[PDB]
Write a structure and sequence with these properties.
Distance between the termini of chain C: 46 Å
Keywords: CCT, Gb5
Number of helices of chain C: 18
Strand order of the largest sheet of chain A: 9-15-14-10
Shape of chain C: globular
Bound molecules: adenosine-5'-diphosphate, magnesium ion
Radius of gyration of chain A: 30 Å
Radius of gyration of chain C: 30 Å
Strand content of chain A: 15-25%
Number of strands of chain C: 20
Entry title: CCT G beta 5 complex closed state 12
Shape of chain A: elongated
PDB class: chaperone
Chains A, E: T-complex protein 1 subunit gamma
Strand content of chain C: 15-25%
Organism of A, E: Homo sapiens
Distance between the termini of chain A: 24 Å
Number of strands of chain A: 21
Chains: A alpha+beta, B mainly alpha, C alpha+beta, D alpha+beta
Structural class of chain A: alpha+beta
Strand order of the largest sheet of chain C: 7-14-13-8
Helix content of chain A: 40-55%
Oligomer: part of a larger assembly
Largest sheet of chain C: 4 strands, antiparallel
Largest sheet of chain A: 4 strands, antiparallel
Chain lengths: ~525, ~55, ~525, ~525, ~50
């Protein structure tokens, strides 16, 4: 092992090879999901290494299950994840755009242009892209339920749930509206925590609905408890209702005969005292995140109280939001306002071969459960993903009331605006600017390719149409492959989604263009 | 019915909520992975192995 | 053009080690062949002239016997159809206690003839329907073939005569003596109440003096010694304690807290005095034998020796329960002296040696009691095990006789009559089921054929003579074992009788097993993998 | 090769027609395996596990689970069939057959250059029309005993032997009618299914009470009680350890004896409460007292109870608490703080049955039990499993027939009529989706084809005879498995569950549409 | 081939029934001679 300045496993490559490899890896990542964009997309079957099957056409779902070695592909996958987490839509679009910009950048890199010039041109182009998108946007009236439903339909028409589009749109809109919250002058939506999606295989998807409350896979602890209460008063708890040890070591020393029975009797009396403290509020349902003793169950049933134990913390928080209750740890400190009044029906009913607890008649609930009933587990998972996309789109348009034409209209309009802007640059960086501007045409091109129409003729017609004055809303009909105005077709997208997609694609191109050397093989050196 | 591990299913669909890979060790790699630097599980196989690898 | 690829579809989706057999010749014929092979392996051990088989299991344990159920249990049968037939045989053994070889032979013959029927052109459904119809006809006919009834079960001679036939297949050389032993043991058991318990008969095996020295004891024998110095009692007053013969301790945690010197000095003396008082209170009730299920304290043993009390320790709770049943005592949970109704009584308890084994005997003088023990002697452990299996067969036959007292002639008469009657019935039945009915009738010939083959004579001549004799109308005529030439003789006069319930259940189970095997069309076997247990 | 293989060299990819061919081949293989299952004339299959356990069954779900398959499309179809079994409990084999025939008919047109999207659109339109026709064709009736018996027979004959099916039909119908409460959902948890392995398979019957797989552990307790009071309790009667690490301290043997005698006072108090209640309710010896406890009972308490002529059972099942409460009519108790005679159940006969090592307790002759038990009996283990599966299918069928006031004629008549209606409706569909509608109709036509094939008759000739008879008469005529001639299913009594048909249509159409639209199968999670 | 298989199949039945193979062979030879006789009996001439 003579000399070996660096380690023997340290491999270094640099030059044009690194740039070409990074751009080719990004292009391959784009090509993986190129066919999954548009209303006429085809689904893909992904085999989970743990043995499961993921059957979907979402870009993020497909890319997340793919393991790659080239770090540029890792960057692209992280880009997909970022786009999914930020806005929740446009995941395939950002990947395709990043690939196209990286290709048109490779075009200039083959010549004697330094990457910094390309990066500066890309940044100027991105600023103009943002400006044009803001200019060509239109406002939306959030009070109009029909137009909100239309927006959600335009969002979900490219997914498998598009068949039951009206049902999906109604479910998503209702869930987003009721989970919306306002407290202490702070507005929030929080679809991640509340608006839980519970999927039960079987039944028909036409029976799916969003409940005015929370549904959990729990049963009563004792059969004698009621499984149907009209207007329950629900009390939520964290601490167990059973005799537990203390924190400190508490060894006892029994000498007299009656101390053992006295200790057991005091255990029973402590359980009874806790149960009496609970009963003092006169509730009907008691929910606990931890166990409930059998003696506690007896003392609660003596007061005609239904008790459910071992409930997850997230489910308990969701129930508290739905029925307007507060979780209390110490029963002796329970007070009147902590009792949850507002639930209009509680019912433990059997679905299939399992017991499910329904609290499904709350008045003004701040949490909900979407009950999905479908053919199988994978189909229900895909439906859940589509409905998550719908809820994300609804939240985005609620936070940002701006709206942008879809179906390729926005990309072509922005490209044309940037082209006439670059017409008066008179510099060396005008060429990358124009190239990255025209790279936006990959979205209408992909739509036409997936539809099956003639790519060249349709793109030429669209480009000619966009040269006119009032033609910023002209795109491609992804189902028929014909030019059509989107103020008639009705396809629209939130401005936030387009802005995030454009920004993420341009910054991915910049980040991958900044790199010209790769070294690997060294250990972590923690 | 407690013996059938009712919590198995809930752990199943709460485990999937994260994906990286296990390190593939080089005769001296085994020596110097444990010689330096906690509980460590090491898998021995030659290409049921895939199932436990996914586990 | 050098390889045949797997056909698209299920043939390609099969696992690496799995197997799939489908169709008639690939599954049904193979299953029939396997069952016929199993029946062939077990065939030679049928009847009084059956031959013992040395079977060594995976644990290098040697079994020598002619009991079909034991042989099947000790074999590592792997074929699923043969496994099913073995399950049927074991079910017959559990339900009745005898006829396992009959079940196996009948199932094998039925499956062979079913294969023949399928080959000549019949369908599986038609064969199954014909077999079911013929089984119903046989079960209808069988009550008419009853020759005599037990008519008494408290008599030693009648019970011995009835049980001789059951234990004539096993230990054919000397069955009268074993019949007398089992008859005495069963008559001691089975009180005025009609319920008979099989577990009330106990078998003790002691090497050395040959089976001719075996005897029946009205009581129990335990192969161990006594803890105390007293080794014999003549008016025993057994007091059984389930708790250890020691001062009971706390259940949570016991700590002797000493705070002064006087307590330290007096603790041991007080403990010894207290346990002395306990033992003296136990002895003052007239008790002189103490049986415990737990350990024996050294100081407790000392104080029991001081008061002349016999100590017997029984580790297994089953032995304690059986001793309580056979003496009349109640297993006390504490060291309290026994009340008058809880005090067991035995005629004589003593320590004795048989061969080189030290045993404790709980002996009664009355010819009654709840539990009786048979002491088995022999020159080999395997021989005593085989004799024990024969004793189990005899006891099960007695239990069956208690359940149902009807008897049918043995020695080939019953199934020959059944075959003749079913053949006559089938000839009057039009349709394709007549072939299956006739084959079901012919399958009964496998029993006299096996008996004749084991006896060393020509089976065909015996079968022809049996058909002739039954054609005149002598339905109680079977083949004569003690003859160098094919001959027949009356079975009612010779006392060669087998229980009606045994034949009924054996026929039912064999027919069910054969039909269930026939119903199978496809086999999807998984990879064997491991799982030694 | 493909783009994915460049990034992950050791990845398996099937693109374009390759993925469709793979999926269709898997579906065709599954359908070919499960063709022989359909109908009462289907053939039993033997399944041997790795350990060597033998299972005989005709159920589609059981066969799918026991098949040695590692295919993705097979996994998807197995999940669909599993959901079918979980919700409705029937139609798994029909599910697989319809999925396979849908895929085959779709491929018949796809191989001619047609895009699968048009086929899926035709599938959706035909599914809507078929659902409308199914709503139009269902027979709404009052679910009396005869109709329920017919439905149970129709299921069990396809599941087991004809005579065993006839016995199990009466068993299941009587059980369901026993537990049924007016205008309330049927709780299938209240029908205990117990397996005993000593009698013949036709000896299985229904007990208007409960059977427990354990008996009294004290040998001196009574083996049979004529008139019994039932005490269903959830109170531990064994020794309990103090939660706070108590420990005992003493200075002499007498103190140790006193502590030992005083350490069992807590449990003895509850035992005395039970004994006092027993003395109060039945001061004489005619009546009896039976105690069923979900928790254990130590030998001291067992002996104390047996001294008073009380039979006690420990470590009972949790569901048995509710089962005893609904059957015997008592009140389950979690504590003996205040126990009164009104909390005691009743039972007209309690006795213990011994089967080898196993002990069984029978609680029969109840007043009006809302919970009953089915005692599965047989000579083998595979027989018990087969009878249990058949009983589950029959219970599901009867419950579905009760829930849905309507019932659908069987023998494939409904599907022949649905195919004819789809053919008639086909011209009303614009575009090339008419090919999808035709494929859908041909796919639903599989069930009469498979029934005729299993019965041995010619497939196409029987199908055209059925179709001609249906067109001429307009009735709901299905395949007669004995002669092959058309037969009116309603007149004979071959009934099918309406919910089963609806779920079949929905699930099969959804899964076929999803599979047809798949154009790539990937496995790139390694490295 | 089919005839030989069937003849051996039906001979196994007698072999399993304590019949020595020589008797079976003698019966087979007698049967073969009578088959030859019968076949020559039912034959018909042909004008070539
Ligand atoms: N009916 C339609 N006609 C034409 N284009 C459409 C239609 N519906 C959606 N699109 C376009 O398809 C794109 C959505 O593709 P999609 O598959 O949702 O990718 P992603 O999931 O990454 O958003 C949007 O840009 C939209 O303009
Ligand atoms: N002395 C005898 N003479 C003729 N046959 C006998 C005699 N003793 C028993 N058998 C026959 O032997 C058969 C019992 O065979 P056995 O070996 O006991 O098989 P299994 O144990 O399965 O019943 C009975 O059917 C009976 O007819
Ligand atoms: N006696 C009968 N005559 C004709 N057809 C029948 C009869 N019994 C059942 N069927 C038909 O057989 C089908 C039941 O097949 P089955 O094996 O139960 O499949 P699955 O288990 O998937 O429901 C039903 O559609 C019914 O129409
Ligand atoms: Mg999208
Ligand atoms: Mg016998
Ligand atoms: Mg069915």
């Amino acid at each position: 092992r003579p000399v070996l300045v660096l380690s023997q496993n340290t491999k270094r490559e640099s030059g044009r090879k690194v740039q070409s490899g990074n751009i080719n890896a990004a292009k391959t990542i784009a090509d993986i999901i190129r066919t999954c964009l548009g209303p006429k997309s085809m689904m893909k079957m992904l085999l989970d290494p743990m043995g499961g099957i993921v059957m979907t056409n979402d870009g993020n779902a497909i890319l997340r299950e793919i393991q790659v070695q080239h770090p540029a592909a890792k960057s692209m996958i992280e880009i997909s994840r970022t786009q999914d987490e930020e806005v929740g839509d446009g995941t395939t679009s950002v990947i395709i755009l990043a690939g196209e910009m990286l290709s048109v950048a490779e075009h200039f890199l083959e010549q004697q242009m330094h990457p910094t010039v390309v990066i500066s041109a890309y940044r100027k182009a991105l600023d103009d892209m943002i400006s044009t998108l803001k200019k060509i946007s239109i406002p939306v009236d959030i009070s109009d339920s029909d137009m909100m439903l239309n927006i959600i339909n335009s969002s979900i028409t490219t997914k498998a749930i598009s068949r039951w589009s009206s049902l999906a749109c109604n479910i998503a809109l209702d869930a987003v509206k009721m989970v919306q919250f306002e407290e202490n002058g702070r507005k929030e939506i929080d679809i991640k925590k509340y608006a839980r999606v519970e999927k039960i295989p079987g039944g028909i998807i036409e029976d799916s609905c969003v409940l005015r409350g929370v549904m959990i896979n729990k049963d009563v602890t004792h059969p004698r408890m009621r499984r149907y209460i009209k207007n329950p008063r629900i009390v939520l708890l964290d601490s167990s209702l059973e005799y537990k040890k203390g924190e400190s070591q508490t060894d006892i020393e029994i000498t007299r005969e009656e101390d053992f029975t006295r200790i057991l009797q005091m255990e029973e009396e402590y359980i009874q005292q806790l149960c009496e403290d609970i009963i003092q509020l006169k509730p009907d349902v008691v929910i606990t995140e931890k166990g409930i003793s059998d003696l506690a169950q007896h003392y609660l049933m003596r007061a005609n109280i239904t008790a459910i134990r071992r409930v997850r913390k997230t489910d308990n928080n969701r129930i508290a939001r739905a029925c307007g209750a507060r979780i209390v740890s110490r029963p002796e400190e329970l007070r009147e306002d902590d009792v949850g009044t507002g639930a209009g029906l509680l019912e433990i009913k059997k679905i299939g071969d399992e017991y499910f607890t329904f609290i499904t008649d709350c008045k003004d609930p701040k949490a909900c459960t979407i009950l999905l009933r479908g053919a199988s587990k994978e189909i229900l998972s895909e439906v859940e993903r589509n409905l998550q996309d719908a809820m994300q789109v609804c939240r985005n348009v609620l936070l940002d009331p701006q709206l942008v034409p879809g179906g390729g209209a926005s990309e072509m309009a922005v490209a044309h605006a940037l082209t006439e802007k670059s017409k008066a640059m008179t510099g060396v960086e005008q060429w990358p600017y124009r190239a990255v501007a025209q790279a936006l045409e990959v979205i209408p091109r992909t739509l036409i390719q997936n539809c099956g129409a003639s790519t060249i003729r349709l793109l030429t017609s669209l480009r000619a149409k966009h040269t006119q004055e009032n033609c910023e809303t002209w795109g491609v009909n992804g189902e028929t492959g014909t030019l059509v105005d989107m103020k008639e077709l009705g396809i629209w997208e939130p401005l936030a989604v387009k802005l995030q997609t454009y920004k993420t694609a341009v910054e991915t191109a910049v980040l991958l263009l900044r790199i010209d050397d790769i070294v690997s093989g060294h250990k972590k050196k923690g | 019915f407690l013996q059938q591990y009712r919590k198995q299913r809930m752990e199943e669909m709460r485990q999937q909520l994260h994906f990286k890979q296990v390190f593939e060790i080089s005769g001296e790699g085994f020596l110097d992975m444990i010689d330096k630097e906690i509980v460590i599980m090491v898998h021995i196989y030659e290409d049921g192995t895939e199932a436990m690898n996914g586990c | 053009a050098l390889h045949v690829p797997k056909a698209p579809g299920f043939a390609q989706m099969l696992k690496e080690g799995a197997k799939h057999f489908s169709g008639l010749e690939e599954a049904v014929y193979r299953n029939i062949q396997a069952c016929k092979e199993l029946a062939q392996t077990t065939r030679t051990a049928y009847g009084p002239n059956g031959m013992n088989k040395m079977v060594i299991n995976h644990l290098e344990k040697l079994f020598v016997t002619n009991d079909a159920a034991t042989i099947l249990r000790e074999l590592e049968v792997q074929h699923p159809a043969a496994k099913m037939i073995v399950m049927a045989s074991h079910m017959q053994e559990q339900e009745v206690g005898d006829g396992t070889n009959f079940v196996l032979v009948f199932a094998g013959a039925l499956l062979e003839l079913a294969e023949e029927l399928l080959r000549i052109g019949l369908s599986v459904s038609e064969v199954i329907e014909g077999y079911e119809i013929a089984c119903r006809k046989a079960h209808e006919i069988l009550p008419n073939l009853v020759c005599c009834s037990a008519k008494n079960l408290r008599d030693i001679d009648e019970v011995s005569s009835l049980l001789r036939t059951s234990i004539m297949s096993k230990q054919y050389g000397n069955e009268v003596f074993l019949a007398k032993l089992i008859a005495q043991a069963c008559v001691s058991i089975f009180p005025d109440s009609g319920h008979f318990n099989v577990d009330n008969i106990r078998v003790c095996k002691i090497l050395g003096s040959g089976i001719s020295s075996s005897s029946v004891l009205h009581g129990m024998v335990f192969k161990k010694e006594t803890e105390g110095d007293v080794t014999s009692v003549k008016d025993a007053k057994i007091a059984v304690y389930s708790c250890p013969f020691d001062g009971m301790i706390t259940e949570t945690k016991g700590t002797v807290l000493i705070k002064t010197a006087e307590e330290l000095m007096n603790f041991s003396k007080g403990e010894e005095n207290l346990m002395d008082a306990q033992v003296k209170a136990i002895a003052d009730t007239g008790a002189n034998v103490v049986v415990t299920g737990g350990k024996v304290a050294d100081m407790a043993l000392h104080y029991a020796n001081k008061y002349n009390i016999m100590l017997v320790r029984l580790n297994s709770k089953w032995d304690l329960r059986r001793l309580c049943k056979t003496v009349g005592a109640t297993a006390l949970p504490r060291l309290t002296p026994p009340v008058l109704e809880e005090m067991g009584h035995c005629d004589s308890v003593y320590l004795s040696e048989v061969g080189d084994t030290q045993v404790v005997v709980f002996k009664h003088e009355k010819e009654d009691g709840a539990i009786s023990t048979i002491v088995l002697r022999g020159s080999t452990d395997n021989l005593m095990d085989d004799i024990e299996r024969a004793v189990d067969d005899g006891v099960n036959t007695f239990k069956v006789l208690t359940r149902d007292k009807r008897l049918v002639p043995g020695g080939g008469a019953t199934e020959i009559e059944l075959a003749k009657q079913i053949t006559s019935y089938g000839e009057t039945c039009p349709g394709l089921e007549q072939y299956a009915i006739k084959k079901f009738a012919e399958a009964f010939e496998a029993i006299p054929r096996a008996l004749a083959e084991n006896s060393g004579v020509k089976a065909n001549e015996v079968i022809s003579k049996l058909y002739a004799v039954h054609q005149e109308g002598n339905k109680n005529v079977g083949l004569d074992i003690e003859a160098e030439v094919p001959a027949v003789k009356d079975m009612l006069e010779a006392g060669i009788l087998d229980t009606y319930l045994g034949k009924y259940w054996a026929i039912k189970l064999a027919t069910n097993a054969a039909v269930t095997v026939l119903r199978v069309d496809q086999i999807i076997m998984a990879k064997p993998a491991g799982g030694p247990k | 090769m493909a783009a994915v293989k460049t990034l992950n060299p050791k990845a398996e990819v099937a693109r374009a027609q390759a993925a469709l061919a793979v999926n269709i081949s898997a579906a065709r293989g599954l359908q070919d395996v499960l063709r022989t299952n359909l109908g009462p004339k289907g053939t039993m299959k033997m399944l041997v596990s790795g350990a060597g356990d033998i299972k005989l069954t005709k159920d589609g779900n059981v066969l799918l689970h026991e098949m040695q398959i590692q295919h993705p499309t097979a996994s998807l179809i197995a999940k669909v069939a599993t959901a079918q079994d979980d919700i409705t409990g029937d139609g798994t084999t029909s599910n697989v057959l319809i999925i396979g025939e849908l895929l085959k008919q779709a491929d018949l047109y796809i191989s001619e250059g047609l895009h699968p999207r048009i086929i899926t659109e035709g599938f959706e339109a035909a599914k809507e029309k078929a659902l409308q026709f199914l709503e139009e064709v269902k027979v709404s009736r009052e679910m009396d005993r005869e109709t329920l018996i017919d439905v149970a027979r129709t299921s069990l004959r396809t599941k087991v032997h004809a005579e065993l099916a006839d016995v199990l039909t009466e068993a299941v119908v009587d059980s369901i009618l026993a537990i049924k409460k007016q205008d309330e959902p049927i709780d299938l948890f209240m029908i205990e299914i117990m397996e005993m392995k000593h009698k013949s398979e036709t000896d299985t019957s229904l007990i208007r009470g409960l059977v427990l797989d354990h008996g009294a552990r004290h040998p001196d307790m009574k083996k049979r009680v004529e008139d019994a009071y039932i005490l269903t309790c959830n109170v531990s009667l064994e020794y309990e350890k103090t939660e706070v690490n108590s420990g005992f301290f003493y200075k002499s043997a007498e103190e140790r004896e006193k502590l030992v005698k005083a350490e069992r006072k807590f449990i003895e108090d509850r035992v005395k409460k039970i004994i006092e209640l027993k003395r109060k309710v039945c001061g004489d010896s005619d009546k009896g007292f039976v105690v069923i406890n979900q928790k254990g009972i130590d030998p001291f308490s067992l002996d104390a109870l047996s001294k008073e002529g009380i039979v006690a059972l420990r470590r009972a099942k949790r569901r048995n608490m509710e089962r005893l409460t609904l059957a015997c009519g008592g009140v389950a108790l979690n504590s003996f703080d205040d126990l009164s005679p009104d909390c005691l159940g009743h039972a007209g006969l309690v006795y213990e049955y011994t089967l080898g090592e196993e002990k069984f307790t029978f609680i029969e002759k109840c007043n009006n039990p809302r919970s009953v038990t089915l005692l599965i009996k047989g000579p083998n283990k595979h027989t018990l499993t087969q009878i249990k599966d058949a009983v589950r299918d029959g219970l599901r069928a009867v419950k579905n027939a009760i829930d849905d006031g309507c019932v659908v004629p069987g023998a494939g008549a409904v599907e022949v009529a649905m195919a004819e209606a789809l053919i008639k409706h086909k011209p009303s569909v614009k575009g090339r989706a008419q090919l999808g509608v035709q494929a859908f109709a041909d796919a639903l036509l599989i069930i009469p084809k498979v029934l005729a094939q299993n019965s041995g008759f010619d497939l196409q000739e029987t199908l055209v005879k059925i179709q001609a008879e249906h067109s001429e008469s307009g009735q709901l005529v299905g395949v007669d498995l004995n002669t092959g001639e058309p037969m009116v299913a309603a007149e004979v009594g071959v009934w099918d569950n309406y919910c089963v048909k609806k779920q079949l249509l929905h699930s099969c159409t959804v899964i076929a549409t999803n599979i047809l639209l798949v154009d790539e199968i990937m496995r790139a999670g390694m490295s």
